[PDB]
Amino acid sequence: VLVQDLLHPTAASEARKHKLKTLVQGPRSYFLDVKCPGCLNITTVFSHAQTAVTCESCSTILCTPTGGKAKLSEGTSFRRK
Amino acid sequence: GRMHSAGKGISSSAIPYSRNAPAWFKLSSESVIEQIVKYARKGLTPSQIGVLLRDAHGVTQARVITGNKIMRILKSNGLAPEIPEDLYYLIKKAVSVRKHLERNRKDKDAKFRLILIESRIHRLARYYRTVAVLPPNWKYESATASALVN
Amino acid sequence: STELTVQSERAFQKQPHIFNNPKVKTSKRTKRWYKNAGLGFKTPKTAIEGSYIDKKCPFTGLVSIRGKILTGTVVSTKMHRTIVIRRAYLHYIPKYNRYEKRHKNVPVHVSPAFRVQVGDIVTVGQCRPISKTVRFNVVKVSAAAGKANKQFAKF
Amino acid sequence: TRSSVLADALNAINNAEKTGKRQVLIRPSSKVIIKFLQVMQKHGYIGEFEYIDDHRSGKIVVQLNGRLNKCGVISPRFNVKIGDIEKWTANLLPARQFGYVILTTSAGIMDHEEARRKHVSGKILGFVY
Amino acid sequence: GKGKPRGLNSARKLRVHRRNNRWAENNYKKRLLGTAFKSSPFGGSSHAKGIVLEKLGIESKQPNSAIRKCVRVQLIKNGKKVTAFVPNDGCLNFVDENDEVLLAGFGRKGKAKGDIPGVRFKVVKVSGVSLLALWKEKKEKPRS
RNA sequence: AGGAUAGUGGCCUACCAUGGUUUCAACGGGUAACGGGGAAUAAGGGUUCGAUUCCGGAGAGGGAGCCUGAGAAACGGCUACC
RNA sequence: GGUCGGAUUUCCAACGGGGCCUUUCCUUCUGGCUAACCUUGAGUCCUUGUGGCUCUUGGCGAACCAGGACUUUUACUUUGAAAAAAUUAGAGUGUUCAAAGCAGGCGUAUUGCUCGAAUAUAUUAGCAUGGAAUAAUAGAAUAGGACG
RNA sequence: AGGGGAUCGAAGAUGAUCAGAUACCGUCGUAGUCUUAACCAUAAACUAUGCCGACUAGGGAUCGGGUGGUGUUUUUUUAAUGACCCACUCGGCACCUUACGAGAAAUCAAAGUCUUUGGGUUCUGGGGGGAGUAUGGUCGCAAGGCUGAAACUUAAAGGAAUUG
């Protein structure tokens, strides 16, 4: 140390740092495209949904909120971004 | 931090650097506004409107996708409340604490929390009066607070 | 104003040595005396058109503006034809190289040609003694927005 | 609460200099900070610094050179006369030949010798030597 | 930090705080209260005349064993009786009793000097003559 | 509004209103306080004093009153008590 | 450079300024001394580096005096005047030196000339004046908004 | 003031001890100890370290939360889960080493960024006594609490560490 590059740090360092302590702070949460087996509808959900989102057709459960990332139901498929 | 506590947590929300995002959102901004309006007429506050929008839809930050903030859109569409959302929730919490104290007289801890909550209400009410969001000489009376929250 | 019994007192009120001769009838039918305050101030339209008497007005009265011109915020409008302003200022204490807030409440006569509320800023001009504590008179109301009509409950 | 962001910047800069770091990070990077850094940069007490433009307040990364003995703020920003500039330099500076007092005057944030040339004065900000 | 206000508009607070803490200085307190004017054998005056009432011998404090040969005298101007020390070899015979003497302080502004308890003044002149001149026989004491 | 003054002015009189000052210290108490120019000490910042040769004020034992007079509530002017 | 380390210059280095341009404020008629002339019917000869170019027909005059289709408020800071005199800092001045004082000095004493008696500081308040960094204050949000 | 009143126990009774013991010790023992409705508002109420904010050092733990896993696990011996292991992270009770710094030292990650002295702010102190007394005010039913001197007296009092 004692001579560092605060302007171009390693993405490994940026991966392990807190979201609010990076060089420029931004979210690490993402979004998911979700398919329920009942219908062919595609629905966007937030990774930290914190609410029990429901499909338009199968309007019972699509993801389950938790303290952090929402826990998707075992009867569905997801795709990042 | 924690103006009425000793905590020093951060636990904030770090919105992205992008101010025109997320480059995969296809719904029209007019569809978003009517989505907001029907939610307001359904009877939701701006905070819970935003989270419901952010989850059941792809709208990351409605201020980014639309041209106006949530509360600004409701006010421009004639759906703003008489008292702001955060002030209304503070008065709601104070009424709950006072209602508890009416029968649990010996709860000196609830008495302490009531003073802290009420002093929080008066500080917030001072800000809304000096910015003219509330009318002047608007006062939290602790006797008509039940009617304010219903 | 023009209404509400301008002549309500026990004695007739009208400014000295103006001949309102009831013989000839001109188009205006009445002679009203006014003037300009000088030093860039203007006589208000309400003073030229006014019906009040107010022998202490800088325009429709016998007082003249000379000496200090001051300004301040209005704090009290509870007494007739005069108000009190607050002239806040900073006083320098040399030993600490710092300042302390000080104020002086200045009682000032206000003409009915002007309409003021608590909180507005007015400019006043020195004249001869009017009463025991009055040595200034309102000459210009510097109210632009008013900060009073924006705090009403909305609909 | 943060009340003097310039004090936070200079304190972090001085602390990094004392421990011998070649670089330092600064937040929230006011333009008073940036102008203060520019005056130091011209006189050679620091090197290149880069402004990180996040959308909130900005950050600064300053490359130090070890030639800075101290930089500090004089809070509150006292009003200083032309004749009082000499008094502030005799107190705040270690020698008459070098060092500066940073003034914010109507002509811009400027040091005391350059302000002497312009015959202008303002409120004191700090010192560097 | 420093525990005191710093802002440009904190002049009033700094004045008031310093004014309150001036009352801890003993010089400032005595001067402001007029203690020497009000409660003091002299009226803030360096010298004062006294009429002798009795000659008394105070034993010197530890660790010195001796007799100090002082006199209890009464003040003409304010009616206060105080004790004054008679500094020299002898000079107890040049005070007699019921004489007129001149009194001045020891020089410790109170705080009875040395090992002589309960005395804050000393005799400079007696019967209108310097005690030093009488000690060296430069003059003569008056018969009155 | 009137009287009084040389004149503005609750200066005073009569009528009417309930006002005016204050924690940014009103009001009250003390001052062994006449104010200023200034004196001592003084690296800077400051501490204390200023009854006293210049300016301003007040008084001629303390009050009150008044004539003469441009100008006095005079005092080496007058009227009254103590 | 005939000018014994000695007494510079529109070739200029850096300083402290002003004006103009780049989307850049100076709100607006009232009258003319004809904008630091964006007009050369005519024309002033210093015999070929480059700053001493005449009577100029007008031709769009903010570098100017009050009627207002003229006013965000300060704090701060620069400059200017006033801040009695004496005292203080200080120039001149053999009271024999000195404290001092504001005098004195010079002719051939033929019957006379002359210098002075400066200067600076003297805060905080008030008045103009240049600046718009720092610090505070206000505006168009149900437009009761500006522009003709 | 009412209720409760097992135990222990200011007062007290009492057996010892002692030169005397109305102290330590032993046997009991009233008020208290508990509760309700009101008082009081003081503790070495202590980390003898005000609150907020930034930076400055090297570790292994641990509490709560979240994220990830060429991970384990009893169930389906290859599903959530839950419990563990490993790696980060935020906030917390703290620890160990070293002080580059600070301090008079003990020692301190703050008691550091301090004559190279200014991030914001509140409170407190000016040698020891007299004295937390007098007096005045205020609160309490009292006990007492808060505020709070002076006269006078004195060359020391006190902190940390060394040797005996």
From Swiss-Prot, chain A:
GO terms, molecular function: RNA binding; structural constituent of ribosome; zinc ion binding
GO BP: any one term: maturation of SSU-rRNA from tricistronic rRNA transcript (SSU-rRNA, 5.8S rRNA, LSU-rRNA)
InterPro entries: Ribosomal_eS27, Ribosomal_eS27_Zn-bd_dom_sf, Ribosomal_zn-bd
Major location category of this protein: cytoplasm
Superkingdom of the organism of origin: Eukaryota
Cofactor: record remark: Binds 1 zinc ion per subunit.
Modified positions (S-methylcysteine) in chain numbering: C39
Keyword Cell inner membrane: no
PTM characteristics: The N-terminus is not modified.
Zinc fingers, C4-type class: 36-58
Required co-factors: Zn(2+)
Cellular component, GO annotation: cytoplasm; cytosol; cytosolic small ribosomal subunit
Localization: Cytoplasm
Pfam families, sorted: Ribosomal_S27e
Keywords: Cytoplasm, Metal-binding, Methylation, Ribonucleoprotein, Ribosomal protein, Zinc, Zinc-finger
Additional observations: Present with 43300 molecules/cell in log phase SD medium.
Role summary: Component of the ribosome, a large ribonucleoprotein complex responsible for the synthesis of proteins in the cell. The small ribosomal subunit (SSU) binds messenger RNAs (mRNAs) and translates the encoded message by selecting cognate aminoacyl-transfer RNA (tRNA) molecules. The large subunit (LSU) contains the ribosomal catalytic site termed the peptidyl transferase center (PTC), which catalyzes the formation of peptide bonds, thereby polymerizing the amino acids delivered by tRNAs into a polypeptide chain.
Protein family: Belongs to the eukaryotic ribosomal protein eS27 family.
UniProt-recorded name of the protein: Small ribosomal subunit protein eS27A
Organism of derivation: Saccharomyces cerevisiae (strain ATCC 204508 / S288c)
Curated annotation (Swiss-Prot), chain B:
Encoding gene per record: RPS13
Cross-link Glycyl lysine isopeptide (Lys-Gly) (interchain with G-Cter in ubiquitin) placement: K38, K42
Protein role: Component of the ribosome, a large ribonucleoprotein complex responsible for the synthesis of proteins in the cell. The small ribosomal subunit (SSU) binds messenger RNAs (mRNAs) and translates the encoded message by selecting cognate aminoacyl-transfer RNA (tRNA) molecules. The large subunit (LSU) contains the ribosomal catalytic site termed the peptidyl transferase center (PTC), which catalyzes the formation of peptide bonds, thereby polymerizing the amino acids delivered by tRNAs into a polypeptide chain.
GO molecular function, one term: structural constituent of ribosome
Matches recorded under HAMAP family: Ribosomal_uS15_A (MF_01343_A)
InterPro entries xrefs: Ribosomal_uS15, Ribosomal_uS15_arc_euk, Ribosomal_uS15_N, uS15_NS1_RNA-bd_sf
Modified-residue entries (Phosphoserine), positions: S31
Natural source organism: Saccharomyces cerevisiae (strain ATCC 204508 / S288c)
Primary localisation category: cytoplasm
PANTHER family (UniProt xref): RIBOSOMAL PROTEIN S15P/S13E (PTHR11885), SMALL RIBOSOMAL SUBUNIT PROTEIN US15 (PTHR11885:SF6)
Subunit details: Component of the small ribosomal subunit (SSU). Mature yeast ribosomes consist of a small (40S) and a large (60S) subunit. The 40S small subunit contains 1 molecule of ribosomal RNA (18S rRNA) and 33 different proteins (encoded by 57 genes). The large 60S subunit contains 3 rRNA molecules (25S, 5.8S and 5S rRNA) and 46 different proteins (encoded by 81 genes).
UniProt family annotation: Belongs to the universal ribosomal protein uS15 family.
Compartments reported by the entry: Cytoplasm
Swiss-Prot record, chain C:
Subcellular location: Cytoplasm
The keyword rRNA-binding appears for this protein: yes
InterPro entries in the record: NA-bd_OB-fold, Ribosomal_uS17, Ribosomal_uS17_arc/euk, Ribosomal_uS17_CS, Ribosomal_uS17_N
N-acetylserine carried by residues: S1
Superkingdom of the source species: Eukaryota
Post-translational modifications reported in the UniProt record: N-terminally acetylated by acetyltransferase NatA.
Gene3D superfamilies given in the database record: 2.40.50.1000
Biological process, per Gene Ontology: maturation of SSU-rRNA from tricistronic rRNA transcript (SSU-rRNA, 5.8S rRNA, LSU-rRNA); ribosomal small subunit assembly; translation
One Gene Ontology CC term in the entry: 90S preribosome
Molecular-function GO terms, alphabetical: rRNA binding; structural constituent of ribosome
Miscellaneous comment as given in the Swiss-Prot or TrEMBL entry: There are 2 genes for uS17 in yeast.
UniProt record similarity statement: Belongs to the universal ribosomal protein uS17 family.
Alphabetized NCBIfam families for the sequence: PRK08572.1, uS17_arch
Primary role: Component of the ribosome, a large ribonucleoprotein complex responsible for the synthesis of proteins in the cell. The small ribosomal subunit (SSU) binds messenger RNAs (mRNAs) and translates the encoded message by selecting cognate aminoacyl-transfer RNA (tRNA) molecules. The large subunit (LSU) contains the ribosomal catalytic site termed the peptidyl transferase center (PTC), which catalyzes the formation of peptide bonds, thereby polymerizing the amino acids delivered by tRNAs into a polypeptide chain.
PANTHER family: 40S RIBOSOMAL PROTEIN S11 FAMILY MEMBER, 40S RIBOSOMAL PROTEIN S11-RELATED
Protein name: Small ribosomal subunit protein uS17A
Source species of the chain: Saccharomyces cerevisiae (strain ATCC 204508 / S288c)
Gene that this sequence comes from: RPS11A
Curated annotation (Swiss-Prot), chain E:
Post-translational modification: Hydroxylation at Pro-63 affects translation termination efficiency. The stereochemistry of the 3,4-dihydroxyproline has not yet been determined.
Gene3D superfamilies in the record: Nucleic acid-binding proteins
Compartment(s): Cytoplasm
GO BP annotations listed: maintenance of translational fidelity; maturation of SSU-rRNA from tricistronic rRNA transcript (SSU-rRNA, 5.8S rRNA, LSU-rRNA); regulation of translational fidelity; translation
Cross-link annotation Glycyl lysine isopeptide (Lys-Gly) (interchain with G-Cter in ubiquitin), location: K55
GO molecular function: structural constituent of ribosome
Gene Ontology cellular component annotations, sorted alphabetically: cytosol; cytosolic small ribosomal subunit; ribosome
Keyword Transit peptide: no
Signal peptide: none
Impact reported for P63A: Lethal mutation
Residues modified as 3,4-dihydroxyproline: P63
Domain of life (superkingdom): Eukaryota
PANTHER family, sorted: 30S RIBOSOMAL PROTEIN S12 FAMILY MEMBER
Family: Belongs to the universal ribosomal protein uS12 family.
Quaternary context: Component of the small ribosomal subunit (SSU). Mature yeast ribosomes consist of a small (40S) and a large (60S) subunit. The 40S small subunit contains 1 molecule of ribosomal RNA (18S rRNA) and 33 different proteins (encoded by 57 genes). The large 60S subunit contains 3 rRNA molecules (25S, 5.8S and 5S rRNA) and 46 different proteins (encoded by 81 genes).
Record-linked NCBIfam families: PRK04211.1, uS12_E_A
Additional record remark: Present with 10600 molecules/cell in log phase SD medium. There are 2 genes for uS12 in yeast.
UniProt name for this protein: Small ribosomal subunit protein uS12A
Species of the source: Saccharomyces cerevisiae (strain ATCC 204508 / S288c)
Organism ancestry: Eukaryota, Fungi, Dikarya, Ascomycota, Saccharomycotina
Gene name for this UniProt entry: RPS23A
